[PDB]
Amino acid sequence: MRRSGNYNPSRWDVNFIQSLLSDYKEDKHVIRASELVTLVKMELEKETDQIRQLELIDDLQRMGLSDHFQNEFKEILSSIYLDHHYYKNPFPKEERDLYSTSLAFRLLREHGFQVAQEVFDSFKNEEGEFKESLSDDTRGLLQLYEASFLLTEGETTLESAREFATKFLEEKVNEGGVDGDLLTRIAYSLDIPLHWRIKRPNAPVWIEWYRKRPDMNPVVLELAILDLNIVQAQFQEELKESFRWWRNTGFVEKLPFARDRLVECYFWNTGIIEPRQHASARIMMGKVNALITVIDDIYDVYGTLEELEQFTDLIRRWDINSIDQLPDYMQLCFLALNNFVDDTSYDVMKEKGVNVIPYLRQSWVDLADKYMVEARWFYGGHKPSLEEYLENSWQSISGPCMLTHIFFRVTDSFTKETVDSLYKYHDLVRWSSFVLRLADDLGTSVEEVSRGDVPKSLQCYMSDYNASEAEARKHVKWLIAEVWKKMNAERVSKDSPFGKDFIGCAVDLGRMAQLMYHNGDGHGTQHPIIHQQMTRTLFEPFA
Amino acid sequence: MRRSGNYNPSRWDVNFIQSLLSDYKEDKHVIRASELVTLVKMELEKETDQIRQLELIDDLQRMGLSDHFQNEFKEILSSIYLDHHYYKNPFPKEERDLYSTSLAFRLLREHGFQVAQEVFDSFKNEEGEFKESLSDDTRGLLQLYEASFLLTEGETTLESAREFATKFLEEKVNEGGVDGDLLTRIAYSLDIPLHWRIKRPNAPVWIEWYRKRPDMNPVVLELAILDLNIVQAQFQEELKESFRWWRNTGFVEKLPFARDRLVECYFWNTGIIEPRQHASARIMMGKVNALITVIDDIYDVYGTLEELEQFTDLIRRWDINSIDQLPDYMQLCFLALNNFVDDTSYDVMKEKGVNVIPYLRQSWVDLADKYMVEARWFYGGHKPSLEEYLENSWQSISGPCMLTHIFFRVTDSFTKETVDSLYKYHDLVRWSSFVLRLADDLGTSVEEVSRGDVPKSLQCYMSDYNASEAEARKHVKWLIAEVWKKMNAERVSKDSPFGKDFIGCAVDLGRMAQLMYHNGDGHGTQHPIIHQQMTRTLFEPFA
Ligand SMILES: C=C(F)[C@](C)(CCC=C(C)C)OP(=O)(O)OP(=O)(O)O
Ligand SMILES: C=C(F)[C@](C)(CCC=C(C)C)OP(=O)(O)OP(=O)(O)O
Ligand SMILES: [Mn+2]
Ligand SMILES: [Mn+2]
Ligand SMILES: [Mn+2]
Ligand SMILES: [Mn+2]
Numbered sequence A, B: 001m002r003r004s005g006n007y008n009p010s011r012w013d014v015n016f017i018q019s020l021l022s023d024y025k026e027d028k029h030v031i032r033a034s035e036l037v038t039l040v041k042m043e044l045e046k047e048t049d050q051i052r053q054l055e056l057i058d059d060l061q062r063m064g065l066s067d068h069f070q071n072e073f074k075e076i077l078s079s080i081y082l083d084h085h086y087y088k089n090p091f092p093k094e095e096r097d098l099y100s101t102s103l104a105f106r107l108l109r110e111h112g113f114q115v116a117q118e119v120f121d122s123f124k125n126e127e128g129e130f131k132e133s134l135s136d137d138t139r140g141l142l143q144l145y146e147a148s149f150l151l152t153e154g155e156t157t158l159e160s161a162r163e164f165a166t167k168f169l170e171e172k173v174n175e176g177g178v179d180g181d182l183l184t185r186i187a188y189s190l191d192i193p194l195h196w197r198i199k200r201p202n203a204p205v206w207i208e209w210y211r212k213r214p215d216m217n218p219v220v221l222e223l224a225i226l227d228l229n230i231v232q233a234q235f236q237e238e239l240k241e242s243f244r245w246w247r248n249t250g251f252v253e254k255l256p257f258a259r260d261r262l263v264e265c266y267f268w269n270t271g272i273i274e275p276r277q278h279a280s281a282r283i284m285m286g287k288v289n290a291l292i293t294v295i296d297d298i299y300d301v302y303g304t305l306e307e308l309e310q311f312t313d314l315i316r317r318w319d320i321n322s323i324d325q326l327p328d329y330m331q332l333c334f335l336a337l338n339n340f341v342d343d344t345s346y347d348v349m350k351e352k353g354v355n356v357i358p359y360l361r362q363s364w365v366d367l368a369d370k371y372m373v374e375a376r377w378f379y380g381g382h383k384p385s386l387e388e389y390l391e392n393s394w395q396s397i398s399g400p401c402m403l404t405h406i407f408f409r410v411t412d413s414f415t416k417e418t419v420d421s422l423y424k425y426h427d428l429v430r431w432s433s434f435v436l437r438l439a440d441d442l443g444t445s446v447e448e449v450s451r452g453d454v455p456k457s458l459q460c461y462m463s464d465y466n467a468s469e470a471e472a473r474k475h476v477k478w479l480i481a482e483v484w485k486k487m488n489a490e491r492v493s494k495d496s497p498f499g500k501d502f503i504g505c506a507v508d509l510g511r512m513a514q515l516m517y518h519n520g521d522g523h524g525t526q527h528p529i530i531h532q533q534m535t536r537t538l539f540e541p542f543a
């Protein structure tokens, strides 16, 4: 009679979840690490070779310590940038180096520095093609490929630099060039460039590789391992509170057609809100995400057209005073929602001084509205077209929802204008949700549409230009590259009204999805590799 | 130009309130009692001397074990009552004995058995009047004074009895030293008869008094103390949940003109909802009683007539939209309230299957309205008539709010009909509040008004008949005595839509108020001994 889209039980249960208690929640570490830092710090800024620096910054970064050496990262990069006079389009053609240049470019750009693509010019022959010689320089070559990802449309030099350094890198992988311990790092970046790699869920491995490194330093490595463990604790704390909420709702038993996976839901935020100081957002998100998950299954799995249309209206007019008109299962959910946004608008009001209920309330209305149109197409046995779908797609994924909720928590002082801009669903939001979406649709088009659901990119395209899924798969991949360019441009935009942290969660959300859906769903049914990534960053300690 | 009724700070901090942990929480404790029980349960069901039984029945109760002996109490009093022919219209031939009769009356009536007042007839002399001889049976002359409180208006015999037995008890205490113990355990009942004594916050002293009782049994005395501690742990647990909530609202820092006393607010409930099963109700109430305090201080202390007339109207129409028009502190207060009832109706809707938000909202609306008319008179510099006031007072004290809230968490299943009866504010609710009210107005009269507040019961009588405080004091007391009598008929009523546990809390809310408001202002603000009874009921363990 119904139509449940067969799901599975959260791999982790309360006893484990609710038990969790790492002995890193003590100040002993906090402070040891808090002193071990000042070292790594002064080590850092006592160093002399600018590249030596660029080199540490990237590592400290890829290791999760990014949080403590903030201002260092700046001045260091700040000077370098303008003590190299990187702020000039007209290249001085000092006939620089592929490596240090690819690096200083990468980091500088990543930190919002204007660095003309022209820079990489002193590395190309006459035909304008990249120098033949470069061929021989695996190191710096891998450094350029990696930097060819801080581009925008109208950046052909970076574009091709990538490609050059790509045929190279790969073939060299099949061969060697050097190491064997390079033949992985190289292939590592060659799977997901650093710029598209989310730090947190990836530090460990990086901390390994570094511990190993001969030139490796111990203060740092020690700082690295300690802190990694000092934050795991945090996640564990948050995780529980978010768990407590999930259990309360009782959807798990009162709404079982919906996916049970609150760890997965909380975990996403260990990747999106990297700045540890934002515990609340992380917690909240654990919830926002769970909620969404349930609402989504109610729309594309459980619920009926009648039921949805009405669910969709009640939310629209946020009529809790009719909560008594919907199927009991929709009453529990909506009340839950009402309860969540209301509780959330309270903390925010309590701490920031604003009544944001009218906004958060909106975030949900629109989401649902989008969920609806998909349901209408679906039931209406409708078949959109790549563009038609895509325009709805980036909103039915919740990125905007997830992101508008975060804004209020991550931002310490908003305006109204900002809020308002943000809420037209600011381009940032738009592009960050698009990655989320596309990536998702990449690793979840399968059972998705083959278990009841409207067509997704892959299909929509496949049908659109009557092609193969391999072509569909390629296209979608390309789209993701396009949107990243638009995003890069926006994350660095000066006119951006958003603060560094927020725009930071917008980019990272894109990068998190690129992990989660890099193989499976990490949700619906889950995926080992994902499962492990989770156990290792949420539950297992480091050495 | 606010007013701030200058309050005092909760004598118990965060850390304390947040830490404490009686190991009794350890399951390996329950079971011990779970045996002692079956034991004490047998000594019971194996006893033969009826008077001996009843006797123990009274102890088990007065000691706080009432919870796991219910069905015993039922069978027993049931039988005794039948094989004694208490249901028959008369039976006074002059065979009865003060004691065992004054006692079987009590427990029989108390447990809802209908036993004529004419039983004590067999104890009166010629011109009627209780027999003089028995001016000797001091023992059973206490059991009489004791049962005289299980009356209604139409029962003059019990009225006189109390009149009589006192005359003597009154003196037997100015004797030489019979038992000495007696002297106190007499004067004990003479301060507050047993009927008006909440058991829970009173077991201690009784468990002591019973230890000594040569005619004692150890399995019972052992289960007794064990349970007290096994129970006190519970409270400590519930205590925190409310505390956590209380802390989270941040009223302490944001609504600082409001009384700080969540412990006290939780404590009240240790003695209203006495059946250990209703943990959530006790927990919820920890919050309700808190919301009120705050929302109350907003009305008789801080807030202005513009601000109150508006607070009241919004609450009434209950819209979280116009919320943006309220003064800041009211914005926060309302949202929390909204969140409170909204979160409470959820749990109810969840576990019981119904939407109660519409009824709970009410509970508050009426309270606030009631609180308003008091504000109006006050500012309106109007001095009401004892009755006028009295007609508001029993509602404006929150009794009905407290209770309508309880009802849902205590009642397993109800119906619109019951609910509705309940909400017209059923007599039971009216009686219980009055006691609460008058009792409060006694130990909060000449101290609240003398700092800004409407004239209370006392003061109103005072003017009405232009009498003295003793006359008012005397009246109000008499008044409390009258109400109880209606109460007595309502709790025992066989027409009550209300179910056992609820009817209890209602009765107990009355008795709990006669405790707190006995020495000075119990509740909070500044409790005399009230404090000890609190540390002792919630923090110190028993031998
Ligand atoms: C929960 C998932 F992982 C998604 C992606 C929904 C979006 C919410 C997240 C990621 C917390 O599930 P699903 O792809 O089935 O939703 P969709 O129906 O929009 O495709
Ligand atoms: C304790 C009282 F009965 C109140 C009403 C506060 C609320 C307490 C509960 C629900 C146990 O204190 P107070 O007597 O000062 O209120 P009032 O100003 O109406 O007399
Ligand atoms: Mn969907
Ligand atoms: Mn879905
Ligand atoms: Mn999907
Ligand atoms: Mn008042």
Ligand SMILES: [Mn+2]
Binding pocket: B296, B297, B300, B448
């Ligand atoms: Mn008051």
Ligand SMILES: [Mn+2]
Binding pocket: B440, B441, B444, B445, B448
């Ligand atoms: Mn008072």
